[PDB]
Symmetry: C2
């Protein structure tokens, strides 16, 4: 049973893999609790699964919210650029809070498809903080371990390679030359410079979460230098906290069938589905008829050149380039057609084969090529797109001047100008331990919203009036519009005009912590003033 | 039949109000995560250590499985009856405890520092 778990670890190239049989959110919270303690700051991509935000609130961690680069043309968030991570890790150093940070907690493959480079980001972060920890949310990338050209972008393989590199005397000499080269350069300039880990100080620590059925049992891959020393007992206690028992044979007993299933036959289906995805992209790309209206976005669109740098070229870009794009998460763009993605899903396609459609942006639809995708699915998709193309061509040919102008404005209204995406605004001063940094207390703001006297409901129009009247609008709960299912407003997050504008134009299926017909939960002016005064008094009491 | 292990008050380092008997199990839980504040003492010497006058404060949830209920909780003043009960009971299912290494306990220096900080905080808050 333990031997079987070792076989599973071999399959995923981890050191110890733990199975959580209560969904992926349970495993996320388990890792968050095991690693983070109260106070210990945690960097996190704002788009991460909301389970991570709740785990941070439970563990009292001070979250530093990293924001991803926007894509206004397609109205999506790509990923957080490594330069931003370094800039944050150094902006903390100015205030002296850098010792606190314990988890980078990046997602490994964002919702839309963009793929991080774990090895490079860990190398460039372990230079600043040689004892940090990394939790890689691999929900959307669990399958991408069978294909060799995407294996090296997984958390476990990157961590293993980083571990081996640091222990090589060749890397010792390389680090010595690298350090000798940048003597006399201000530390603050390390953001604009390639960085390397210190071979002696750096300790790789990586935790990954994989859905069992995606390649509701979940998984936890652990490859940590100091697991038996600084996290073993804490990991067991978190496991007990969020699961009936600490790791036991029964949890392991389930694994053996899954390990056989994946190690014998699973990977072949992943390779096959990747081939289907690549073929489908080529067919849209090459076909004379589809390509008139339908474009599948690729690296050149979702990845701005600033973050960019045959078979050998392909492998080298996927091994060294910062941002690549997963083939199996297609982002079909229909701005030319002039129809909204919601309309496309409703009328034309929706789902009729192994293919699923997860979200539908303003002028696109994200198509996922899951493990149930066969040749017939490619044929069906191509035929549907072809029929739509011929119908559109016929309509355009038969269209008059007025009809052509109407079509042109349809394309203009959903292709040229789109609302600017909202970024994380700020934490309210009363929920920020030190005013120098930009991390806030998300737990205090969480429970501080329970008080009915402190909380109030404000309408969108009244919210705009208040902002125009200079009244801070602080949220009191997680507002989670559910196109991607990640929070827009977190407890205590200051509300900005961009947030109101985005919220004022939402027809999404599901929203949590939002009651459009009643108002929006926001801290009252008196409550915020009281909390800010209390925080200022607490800070001043130390100087007494 | 040895008497059952009745709950023993939370250690004075983890009690927000010294007058009352309610502890702070969250701080005791997280304060035990540290490795320099945790110590292992074998059961055979727990009674001797208590006799000397030390305050043995546990750091983990000791939960003998078949009973299903925690004998010890973080910040609990390990008492002699609990020592005897744990020594006698030898069921292999005991979460948060092991009989080969020892019984997790806050180191006396850690307890002194925590209690000093708690006393300072209580004095300042009252003022």
């Amino acid at each position: 049973i333990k031997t079987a778990m070792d076989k599973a670890a071999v399959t995923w190239n981890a050191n110890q893999t733990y199975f959580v049989t209560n969904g992926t959110s349970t495993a996320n919270k388990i890792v968050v609790q095991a690693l983070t303690r109260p106070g210990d700051i945690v960097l996190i991509d704002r788009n991460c699964h909301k389970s991570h935000h709740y785990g941070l609130v439970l563990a009292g961690a001070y979250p530093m919210y990293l924001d991803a680069y926007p894509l206004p043309q397609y109205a999506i968030y790509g990923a957080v650029p490594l330069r931003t991570i370094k800039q944050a890790l150094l902006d903390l150093e100015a205030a002296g809070q850098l010792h606190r940070v314990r988890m980078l907690l990046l997602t490994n493959c964002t919702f839309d498809g963009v793929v991080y480079n774990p090895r490079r980001v860990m190398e460039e972060v372990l230079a600043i903080k040689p004892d940090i920890c990394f939790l890689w949310d691999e929900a959307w990338y669990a399958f991408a371990t069978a294909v060799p050209w995407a294996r090296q972008r997984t958390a476990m393989i990157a961590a293993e390679r980083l571990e081996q590199m640091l222990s090589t005397a060749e890397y010792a000499e390389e680090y010595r030359n690298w350090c000798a080269s940048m003597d006399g350069v201000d530390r603050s300039e390390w953001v604009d410079h390639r960085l390397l880990p210190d071979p002696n100080r750096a300790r790789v620590r990586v935790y990954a979460t994989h859905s069992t059925h995606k390649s509701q049992a979940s998984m936890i891959h652990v490859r940590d230098q100091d697991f038996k020393a600084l996290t073993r007992d804490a990991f067991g206690e978190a496991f007990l906290t969020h699961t009936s028992t600490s790791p036991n044979q029964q949890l392991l007993a389930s694994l053996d069938l899954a390990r056989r299933q994946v190690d014998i036959e699973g990977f072949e289906l992943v390779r096959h589905v990747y081939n289907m995805a690549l073929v489908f992209r080529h067919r849209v790309r090459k076909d004379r008829l589809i390509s008139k209206w339908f474009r599948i976005l690729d690296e050149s669109d979702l990845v701005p050149d600033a973050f960019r740098s045959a078979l050998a070229d392909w492998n080298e870009a996927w091994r060294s380039d910062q941002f690549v794009l997963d083939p199996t998460r297609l982002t079909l763009f229909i701005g030319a057609t002039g129809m909204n993605g919601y309309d496309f899903r409703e009328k034309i396609l929706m789902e009729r084969f192994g293919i699923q459609i997860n979200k539908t942006s303003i002028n696109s639809v994200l198509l996922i090529f899951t493990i149930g995708v066969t040749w017939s699915s490619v044929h069906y998709l191509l035929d549907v797109l072809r029929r739509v193309a011929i119908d559109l061509d016929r309509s355009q040919k038969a269209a008059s001047g007025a009809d052509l102008a109407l079509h042109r404005r349809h394309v203009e209204e959903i292709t040229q100008d789109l609302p600017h995406l909202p970024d994380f605004s700020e934490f309210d001063l009363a929920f920020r331990p030190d005013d120098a940094s930009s991390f806030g207390d998300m737990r205090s703001a969480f429970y501080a919203g329970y008080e009915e006297a402190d909380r109030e409901y404000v309408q969108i129009g009244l919210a705009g009036r208040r902002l125009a009247e200079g009244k801070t609008l602080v949220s009191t709960t997680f507002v989670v519009p559910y196109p991607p299912g990640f929070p827009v407003l977190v407890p205590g997050q200051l509300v900005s005009k961009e947030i109101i504008y985005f919220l004022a134009q939402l027809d999404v299926k599901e929203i949590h912590g939002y009651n459009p017909d009643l108002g929006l939960s926001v801290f009252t002016q008196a409550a915020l003033a009281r909390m800010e005064a209390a925080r200022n008094a607490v800070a001043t009491v130390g100087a007494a």
